[PDB]
Design a protein around this ligand. Structure first.
Ligand SMILES: O=P(O)(O)O[C@H]1[C@H](OP(=O)(O)O)[C@@H](OP(=O)(O)O)[C@H](OP(=O)(O)O)[C@@H](OP(=O)(O)O)[C@H]1OP(=O)(O)O
Ligand SMILES: [K+]
Ligand SMILES: [K+]
Ligand SMILES: [Mg+2]
Ligand SMILES: [Mg+2]
Ligand SMILES: [Zn+2]
Ligand SMILES: [Zn+2]
Ligand SMILES: [Zn+2]
Lengths: 177, 100, 378, 29, 118, 189, 167, 56
RNA sequence: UGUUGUAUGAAAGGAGAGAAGGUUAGCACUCCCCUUGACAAGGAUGGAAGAGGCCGGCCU
């Protein structure tokens, strides 16, 4: 069979309910444990709720996860930006990958993005920590069907209605208050 | 040339042997009776004072050989265009034109 | 193969006869399963060569010259688009768009795009994936608005030319692939075998789309221009000429289809309930029943299965004209169970319209046999 | 060599073989 | 005889506005060029001559780019029917369609024409 | 909207495709080899018995004789063949360029004159972005006083001039300004 | 990395070596490029030996990642050693190799008919890989001197330059 | 087992610190196979033990 | 606080592949290389020169 899975297996799964619809994200918890732990803990405490997908570059990315909506504000669970972590089997070559956004090296916040196609130049610059699977990837694509105004802003941005941890790979996440 | 430019072509003095679609036979009307050669001389021939003066290719600047042509044979073959007007007569995306 | 007209430079060997020989026996010279380690694909085609036979390569490149493989692909995509455009109201298609096909698509055998998109007016109940030749499809499975169609071409050979099975395999590989770009979860893949002139499809069907594709593919394989140029180039490569002055009088499409890969059985049961009238002393005419028969005929092998119905079955019953029809369906189911699996039919053609209903009821173990009624009953 | 030719309905040969329509010939006989 | 019948009924398909079918025929007759019997090849060429006249050079399928370099080795054929029908086809392309070939091609095809004078 | 099934398991095969078979050929049970195996078994069964004349299949009937091969070969399921592109076109270069070959019928390359692009050339043009980019560009082939159009008024021959300026221009010269055409006094709104 | 560096020193940028050690051109070649990019039996012999080694190591990789069972590893290894002719293509360079290949096939019959006895039916599950593995090891005992000599000549001709007087 | 275009795996990312699966081992009887039970499936099972093998 | 320390292949533009009529087959002598694991074989027969005397020139 000439079809090969190039990627290591996932472990752990997070549901996003959005105004585009539902999104299943399953996580690479061995390969990128910091960002996965971050993302699960922010989901368990409703950090992402009512955050918009503020930056959209069609055929490239859909950015999100800023509670201000500005494009400049994120708080990790570690009180500080955390490190990048790369894997040789995790490469930006397809749509439906979930990665952490940053401004520069070792600067990770709560912002993330979905990819919408091949992005070769994002390699070794952004931590890939999850992928979108099932039919819900088609819902993800509909996040990029927006009327995009200047500076890559939607007219009426889609937003996150809730989150849900379907399966938690870690055992010791204590959500903050 | 393209199809609208073929009225600008010159004709051979002798009539064509394949009569259909010819421009120089009596029946076509392009070979007319009682022609005065001095009156029809400057038609579709070079005239440096007249309207068809010695032209050069707009691309390569070498001299064309047909009156009223703006593109020399090689440049027109390679770009796929009519030698007189420059409208394209051929889609050359899949043709590696070889000048050899 | 002889000299094609009526009676009355450099030395070396000429490769015209050897290349003719190598084209003609090429499904067997180009066996794909003899040794299955390495393969070479030719440049603009989807022909695989197993082993380096260099007269065969010249034979094949002479056929697919001047980008014929792409040309065939685009001609079939154009023809299917013109089929669906005639049918926007009946299937409730809002629009039919042809995808801007990445130019190298039709001979790239690892991955595929979509070729046609259908956008719905409202929504289409979508069933689970099945073949083009299956029958009983339940439209409950999913619901959608987009629906893609993907055209595949292949060149088979002697060891491998099952086209239904190819269509299934390519569908399940491409739609479950991680690197796939399909616009929706639902669609169909259509596979055409140019070496053998076979075709099939596999995928999701929305209501009314399977019969449409069946007719469309039959018509397209019969009458495409680019396929005519392909078959014409093969015959010139082989220098094959026809002895016969015209096409056979019974050249109808239905007649031609009877001799495809699929098994087709004619069932004739008008003679099942058969009687004789004779004169009585009472003055009223009487009918005595006599033995009947069901005819099942396989045209390709010329096999007649004759089921002799003895009148003992009719003894104690009241309305006989239906019992015979019901019996006719049960006996046909019996014969299909009795035969080996490779003997069993794909289509059954019934001479009598009313026979069509019970038979389809009684064949439950065999849901994929279609039953229909032709125009050439005999 | 053994249709090679197009089929046309031939001229009624019952006048040749039997002298008239075969069914009529049985009727008289 | 079949190629002769195409050459007679080419005009009827123009009046019947069925250029798609005649276009298809031109594509079919292009594969019959490799004929080895000169009588058949001359009629294939005659049929082609008629289709070029009826549809025109710029809508012709196979394009004149494909048809003219196919025709230049057919020039060598010494049979008179082939030469006659090929030279007319070549000479008609030479004026109405000269941008479909390179100048080196017209030069070598020009050289070839010196054998047509015998 | 596609909704999630909400399962905890990951999607895909659990062994990550480490055992993915080749399923492009016909099924093992319906295969030519398997059919042959059934026929051999049925002939073993009928070996000692009488001819009973019942139908068992088109292939396998009573053969009175004691018990590669004819058929298609079945292919290995788990072996994935390695494919490479044959980019060598095998065209006669002389025949393609000039239409003349010194080998004739002995030439062992293709006598074909078409010059379409190769597959890798199409791919390089698609990568570089230069596939069809040239369709965009085609090769098709007052002001005396420089003031406002104070009565833009015409002559015989399209030369739209100002009114009192061109009356003074006629005072200067009796012909036009644009191409020195004979106006003959004719001067129109 | 060794074979890829050899390809890069020679300016053979139109040949690509993939990670399963197949050498393949990326475009059509001129006559000059076909003459210059032809490699000899030393290169290819070494390349096919490395291809076999990668097939063996990747099976163990698949086991250590968890994707296969230990039984599937043993069956996969014995499949590898009985089918080097289909998996590599080593025989084209040295055909004397066929002797090993034939022998491996002969061991399979010997083992298979002894393994598949009784309730055990014909099918793909036999994993007794010591015999096939043993045969190749002896092949490698003989071919190591040869390739060290041949590859020393390839490297000497690459670094010292071609030697002008000859033999 | 892996694709042509996939580069060979890194040990540190993939294989290091994952538990191996069970190997093929036939269960031994603690009564009947007492003498051979302790070291049967070790690598160089009697290597360290002085009284059975000469040494390392 | 730089520079001629060189070569291969490709593209574009040019030249054009031995045989005292034409079409060609090769194997070598010297010294200049290329592919090659070569004491093999190829690279247009791999390419390039090929009578004597005197000071590129002159004589037989
Ligand atoms: O019994 P299996 O484990 O399924 O082995 C089969 C089968 O072996 P047997 O029929 O001898 O039991 C094939 O034999 P044939 O069907 O061709 O007679 C044999 O072919 P060889 O005898 O040539 O080995 C084939 O091997 P292969 O797949 O290479 O054709 C081999 O399968 P494996 O050896 O691959 O397990
Ligand atoms: K020499
Ligand atoms: K020679
Ligand atoms: Mg030599
Ligand atoms: Mg030679
Ligand atoms: Zn020019
Ligand atoms: Zn024009
Ligand atoms: Zn040739």
């Amino acid at each position: 069979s000439n079809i090969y899975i190039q990627e290591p297996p996932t472990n752990g799964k997070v549901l996003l309910k959005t105004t585009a619809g539902d999104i299943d994200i399953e996580l690479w918890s061995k390969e990128a444990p910091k960002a996965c732990r971050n993302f699960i803990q922010l989901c368990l405490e409703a950090y992402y709720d009512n955050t918009i997908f503020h930056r959209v570059v069609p055929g490239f990315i859909v950015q999100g996860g800023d509670p201000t909506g500005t494009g400049s504000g994120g708080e990790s669970i570690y009180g500080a930006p955390f490190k990048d972590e790369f894997h040789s089997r995790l490469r930006f070559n397809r749509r439906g990958l979930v990665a952490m956004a940053n401004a520069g090296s070792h600067d990770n916040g709560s912002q993330f993005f979905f990819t919408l196609g091949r992005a070769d130049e994002l390699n070794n610059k952004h931590t890939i920590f999850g992928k979108v699977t099932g039919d819900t990837v088609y819902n993800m694509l509909r996040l990029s069907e927006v009327d995009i105004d200047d500076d890559e802003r939607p007219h009426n941005p889609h937003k996150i209605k809730s989150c849900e941890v379907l399966f938690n790979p870690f055992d010791d996440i204590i959500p903050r208050e | 040339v393209c199809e609208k430019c073929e009225k600008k072509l010159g004709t051979v003095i002798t009539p064509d042997t394949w009569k259909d679609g010819a421009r120089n036979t009596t029946e076509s009307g392009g070979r007319k009776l009682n022609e005065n050669k001095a009156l029809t001389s400057k038609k579709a021939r070079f005239d440096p004072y007249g309207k068809n003066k010695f032209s050069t290719c707009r691309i390569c600047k070498s001299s064309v050989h047909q009156p009223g042509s703006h593109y020399c044979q090689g440049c027109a073959y390679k770009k796929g265009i009519c030698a007189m007007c420059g409208k394209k007569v051929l889609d050359t995306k899949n043709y590696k034109q070889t000048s050899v | 193969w002889e000299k094609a007209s009526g009676f009355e430079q450099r030395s070396g060997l000429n490769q015209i006869p050897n290349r003719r020989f190598t084209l003609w026996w090429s499904p067997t010279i180009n066996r794909a399963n003899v040794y299955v380690g390495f393969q070479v694909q030719l440049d603009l085609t989807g022909i695989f060569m197993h082993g380096k036979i260099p007269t065969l390569k010249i034979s094949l490149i002479q056929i697919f010259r001047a980008h014929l493989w792409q040309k065939i692909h685009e001609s079939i995509v154009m023809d299917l688009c013109q089929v669906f455009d005639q049918e926007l109201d009946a299937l409730e298609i809002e629009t039919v768009q042809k995808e801007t096909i990445h130019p190298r698509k039709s001979y790239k055998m690892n991955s595929s795009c979509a070729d046609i998109l259908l956008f719905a007016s409202y929504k289409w109940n979508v069933s689970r994936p099945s073949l083009l030749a299956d029958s009983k499809d339940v439209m409950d499975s999913t619901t959608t608005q987009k629906y893609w169609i993907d055209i595949q071409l292949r060149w088979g050979d002697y060891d491998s030319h099952d086209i239904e099975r190819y269509a299934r395999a390519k569908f399940l590989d491409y739609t479950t692939d991680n690197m796939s770009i399909y616009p929706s979860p639902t669609g169909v893949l259509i596979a055409i075998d140019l070496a053998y002139n076979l075709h099939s499809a596999y995928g999701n069907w929305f209501p009314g789309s399977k019969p449409l594709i069946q007719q469309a593919m039959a018509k397209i394989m019969k009458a495409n221009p680019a396929l005519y140029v392909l078959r014409e180039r093969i015959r010139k490569g082989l220098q094959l000429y026809s002895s016969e002055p015209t096409e056979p009088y019974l050249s109808s499409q239905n007649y031609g289809e009877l001799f495809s890969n699929q098994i087709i059985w004619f069932v004739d049961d008008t003679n099942v309930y058969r009687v004789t009238i004779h004169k009585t002393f009472e003055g009223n005419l009487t009918t005595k029943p006599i033995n009947g028969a069901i005819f099942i005929f396989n045209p390709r092998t010329g096999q007649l299965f004759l089921k002799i119905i003895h009148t003992s079955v009719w003894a104690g019953q009241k309305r006989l004209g239906q019992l015979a029809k019901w019996k006719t369906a049960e006996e046909v189911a019996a014969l299909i169970r009795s035969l080996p699996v490779e003997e069993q039919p794909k289509q059954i053609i019934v001479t009598r319209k009313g026979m069509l209903d019970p038979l389809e009821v009684h064949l439950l173990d065999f849901p994929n046999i279609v039953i229909k009624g032709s125009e050439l009953q005999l | 060599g053994k249709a090679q030719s197009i089929y046309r309905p031939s001229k009624n040969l019952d006048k040749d073989m039997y002298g008239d329509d075969l069914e009529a010939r049985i009727k008289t006989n | 005889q079949a190629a002769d019948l195409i050459s007679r009924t080419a005009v009827v398909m123009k009046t019947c506005q069925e250029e798609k079918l005649m276009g298809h025929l031109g594509v079919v007759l292009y594969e019959y060029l490799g004929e080895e019997y000169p009588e058949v090849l001359g009629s294939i060429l005659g049929a082609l001559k008629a289709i070029v006249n009826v549809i025109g050079m710029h809508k012709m399928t196979p394009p004149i780019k494909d048809l003219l370099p196919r025709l230049t080795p057919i020039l060598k054929n010494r049979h008179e029917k082939v030469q006659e029908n090929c030279i007319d086809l070549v000479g008609r392309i030479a004026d109405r369609g000269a941008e479909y070939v390179s100048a080196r091609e017209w030069m070598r095809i020009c050289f070839e024409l010196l054998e047509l004078l015998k | 909207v596609y909704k999630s099934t909400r399962s905890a398991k990951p999607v895909g095969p659990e062994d990550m495709g480490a055992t993915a078979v080749y399923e492009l050929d016909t099924e093992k049970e319906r295969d030519a080899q398997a059919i042959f195996e059934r026929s051999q078994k049925i002939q073993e069964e009928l070996r000692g018995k009488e001819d009973d004349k019942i139908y068992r299949g088109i292939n396998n009937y009573q053969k009175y004789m004691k018990p590669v091969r004819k058929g298609p070969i079945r292919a290995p399921e788990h072996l994935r063949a390695t494919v490479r592109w044959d980019y060598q076109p095998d065209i006669c270069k002389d025949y393609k360029e000039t239409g003349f070959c010194g080998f004739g019928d002995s030439c062992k390359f293709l006598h074909d004159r078409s010059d379409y692009k190769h597959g890798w050339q199409i791919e390089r043009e698609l990568d570089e972005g230069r596939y069809g980019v040239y369709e965009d560009e085609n090769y098709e082939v007052c002001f005396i006083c420089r003031q406002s159009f104070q009565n833009p008024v015409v002559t015989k021959c399209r030369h739209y001039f100002c009114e009192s300026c061109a009356l003074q221009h006629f005072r200067t010269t009796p012909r036009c300004y644009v191409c020195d055409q004979q106006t003959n006094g004719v001067f129109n709104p | 990395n060794m074979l890829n560096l050899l390809i890069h020193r020679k300016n053979l940028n139109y040949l690509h070596l993939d990670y399963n050690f197949n050498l393949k051109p990326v475009k059509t070649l001129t006559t000059k490029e076909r003459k210059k990019s032809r490699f000899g039996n030393a290169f290819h012999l070494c390349r096919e030996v490395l291809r076999l080694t990668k097939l063996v190591v990747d099976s163990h990789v698949q086991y250590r990642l968890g994707n296969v069972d230990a039984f599937q590893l043993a069956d996969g290894l014995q499949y590898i050693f009985a089918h080097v002719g289909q998996l590599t293509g080593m025989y084209r360079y040295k055909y004397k190799l066929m002797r090993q290949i034939r022998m491996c096939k002969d061991l399979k019959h010997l083992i298979y008919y002894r393994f598949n006895t009784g309730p055990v039916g014909k099918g793909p599950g036999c994993g007794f890989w010591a015999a096939g593995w043993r045969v190749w090891l002896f092949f490698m005992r003989g071919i190591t001197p040869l390739l060290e000599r041949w590859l020393g000549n390839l490297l000497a001709r690459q670094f010292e330059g071609r030697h002008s007087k000859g033999v | 087992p892996f694709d042509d275009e996939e580069p060979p795996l890194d040990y540190a990312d993939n294989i290091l610190d994952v538990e191996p699966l069970e190997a093929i081992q036939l269960e031994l009887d603690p009564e009947e196979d007492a003498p051979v039970l302790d070291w049967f499936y070790d690598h160089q099972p009697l290597r360290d033990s002085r009284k059975y093998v000469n040494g390392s």
